[PDB]
Write a structure and sequence with these properties.
The structure is a homotetramer. By secondary structure, chain A is mainly β. The first copy, chain A, has strands spanning about 5-10, 25-30, 35-40, 45-55, 60-65, 75-80, 90-95, 105-115, 125-130, 140-145, 145-150, 155, 170-175, 180, 185-200, 210-215. The two termini of chain A are about 15 Å apart. The complex binds 4-methylumbelliferyl-alpha-D-glucose (MUG) (4 copies), calcium ion (4 copies) and manganese (II) ion (MN) (4 copies). Chains A, B, C, D: This is Concanavalin-A, 2nd part.
């Protein structure tokens, strides 16, 4: 199956699969059952920002989610991505709705990856930044119900013309080019991702969440992965 | 056919297609017959550097080629890429040999593209940098006789195991992801490319050259592109 | 005296010193009498953006000023900065009011300078970016009535507590560190600056303008440079 | 006194002040007696590279020193710089010789600092990169015996015309502009530094070392800080 490493912004507490009883951010290493979580005071209708960082020196994947004039939620987990992910991967954003729903709108997204090898001055780097999305964004691979163009934003899940989010939706957006996330001769490897989102929902319990993920190049939405599975995993194991 | 815009480092003077009677750099807008050229004192066996720049404000495509402790060749041409190229393109490097030959080795390559839109703070950017190439470089589309891995270098054309360049060779390397080179609402669009090369022939006259090009997404080596056509054009018109 | 090279956003037409009879942007090379101008449809109370670019290859200084959902004004001028400016300079922003006034608010400012030398891979670079200013901004040299901290903005000229701009005001802000603007050994030397501003006047007819300038390291506000002189020149010659 | 935070590349083991009995890299927080060290297999006459990184999310200062075709030494230390350093500081390089000596040559140096604020898209950044130093480097504050120009290198300590390092030497180089290393409102604060050095010694026992340091803006070489104090501390407490 696909190998997934993700940072989830889980808005709906699914107690049967191990979710805390409140909105939270978590680090998922090949399983929807987060390796570590942190309470997140999600703000309905407000624009938030997520920062994901990682470096091979201290092998720690960290994430911070904040809103203006509000405290930030933080979560970290020590993990050596060399032993989890293949050398070449694709990075993307995923989101879903189930019985309950919310808009999973991405306003901007940027990513940076660097491989600084042993040889003096032998750096390989990739950097992209979208501050507005086009109707025909040829450098993104859109899967599921993901669409671009609506107000220059990226809608991961389906929203009606009147702006109402729909349930039972799932969508993803991966950057077109494969990323060389790590290599053996690298002295220092690292990546950094940032995205701003707008989760708006009429429900008392918005669902299901957004997630930044890294996967094998040919990753695709596992069947029936709407709702609690965030479009990333085929089952809840 | 393909739409090509290229900066050629022409090492062999083909007088029948308009080449000056000496090595030169030139701006090719949809034709192997350069719109403007400049004498280039090519140095066999030495590592050179090429810098290509362009911006929509003053619509001028410029290039500079230099060698350490040597003068640089420069060429410029006013051209509005909006009227020549499609919004989405692919960028790459091309090279060829014919009756005569040379090594068309690329030691490093970097590219940066930015679209500063009308909407304040709405910048879109792409940046990649290869300071060493891998045997399996999944973010490059290699066409023709192009290969990577050899000393961490990109060999656009065929070289034997003993290092000897072969004639009648043609090869290209395009970056995997499509680049949004321009758009109607962009207040400023621009790009910059840089690469270092090592051209060396054991014969009297080297041939045929290296070229940085921008083309339609699905561009492919035209048949008969060997020799004077530098793997870019189907004919000499 | 000081050596000034500036891109002015002139809001008040001073016909005696050569100003066109309308708001305009212009390139000033050591004189308040612009070498080249362009009509600018200034929008009172709206946030605009200015982009200044320059590169030694095609020796052309260009500027673009735009507002969201509006056309942009553009002006260019061929000039070899090597012959005008000293190798080391300071970059900054200047503004003034005279009999009439306006707010000269800077919301953000970024600058990038690069020197690619003859020796392969030998690049020197400087880059700063302020998206919000602090009350104690130690990396800026504030001259005249310039202050920071008010809403995280830079006020080049004096504005009252109630937000009203004052006349007869002049202020500047230079980046603390000297910039190596050019050097003889460079193959390519280039810079790019961007800033967003908010010009507003209740009197309905604003004066005098804002300007991005490059000068000798020890530059200071010439005596009596309020009004038409934009705080850059000592006289109107 | 000055507040110093430094990563030392200690070549001479001073057992009385706590040095291990071999060359090592260490994290010094306000004291020459490192908080944590790591064995470093220094290679006389070879060019090495140092990478220092830090981020406020996981508050860990890490360093890696490597040589081509050789293992790298690594050292990390959890420390919240907010509680140690003032908001505004200066960054620099320091080096010294004592009874024994070595050349403390810096071939290149780059630094990047970013303050990601709570408010969406509010980022402040500073970045400089020197790949060659000039005889008159106006953006560096040279203290002690530090000089630039010699082959486009930075010599932290005194070396004779014939290239021989001298003992009892101490020199520093700080970047001209103050750096906003942190602020309360920042969601993420981080910095990264990289430099390549060439430590060559005539004898089989080099001394004393090179260090990347962060200090209060007005920092200066302490009296009698030659040798084992690396030009950073006034005493060995
Ligand atoms: C007990 C319960 C009450 C409720 O009000 O909604 C519920 C919704 C549930 O789950 C569904 O809605 C959730 C929120 O969309 C999804 O995570 C999940 O995949 C769906 O099966 C499960 C249980 C309940
Ligand atoms: C005049 C001449 C002399 C020669 O010795 O070889 C020659 C080879 C030529 O062309 C071939 O060799 C050239 C160099 O490889 C190519 O540019 C071209 O496409 C090939 O057809 C063209 C002319 C000559
Ligand atoms: C009295 C008067 C009437 C008028 O219509 O315009 C005037 C413009 C003046 O100019 C001053 O105000 C202008 C706008 O504030 C400045 O450009 C200029 O340098 C100042 O001297 C000064 C006086 C007048
Ligand atoms: C072997 C030796 C003999 C001696 O008489 O003094 C010595 C003094 C030393 O110390 C000085 O030289 C050392 C190496 O340069 C420095 O680390 C230290 O700060 C200096 O005081 C080191 C070694 C000796
Ligand atoms: Ca859940
Ligand atoms: Ca030719
Ligand atoms: Ca005027
Ligand atoms: Ca020591
Ligand atoms: Mn969860
Ligand atoms: Mn030609
Ligand atoms: Mn004017
Ligand atoms: Mn020590």
């Amino acid at each position: 199956a696909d190998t997934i490493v993700a940072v989830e912004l889980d808005t709906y507490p699914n107690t049967d699969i191990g979710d805390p009883s409140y909105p939270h951010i978590g680090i998922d290493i090949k399983s929807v059952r987060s390796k570590k979580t942190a309470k997140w005071n999600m703000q309905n209708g407000k624009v938030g920002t997520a920062h994901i960082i990682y470096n091979s020196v201290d092998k720690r994947l960290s994430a911070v989610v904040s809103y203006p004039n509000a405290d930030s939620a933080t979560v970290s987990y020590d993990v050596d991505l060399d032993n989890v992910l293949p050398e070449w991967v694709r990075v993307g954003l995923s989101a879903s709705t189930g019985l309950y729903k919310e808009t999973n709108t991405i306003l901007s997204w940027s990513f940076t990856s660097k491989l600084k090898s042993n040889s003096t001055h032998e750096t390989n780097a990739l950097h992209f930044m979208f501050n507005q999305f086009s109707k025909d964004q040829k450098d993104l691979i859109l899967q599921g119900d993901a669409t671009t163009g609506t107000d220059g934003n990226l809608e991961l899940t389906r929203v009606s013309s009147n702006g109402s989010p729909q349930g039972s939706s799932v969508g993803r957006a991966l950057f077109y080019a494969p990323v060389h996330i790590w290599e053996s001769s690298a002295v220092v490897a690292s990546f950094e991702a940032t995205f701003t989102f707008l989760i708006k929902s009429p429900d008392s319990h918005p669902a299901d969440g957004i997630a930044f993920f890294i996967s094998n190049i040919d990753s695709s939405i596992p069947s029936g992965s709407t709702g609690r599975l965030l479009g990333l995993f085929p089952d809840a194991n």
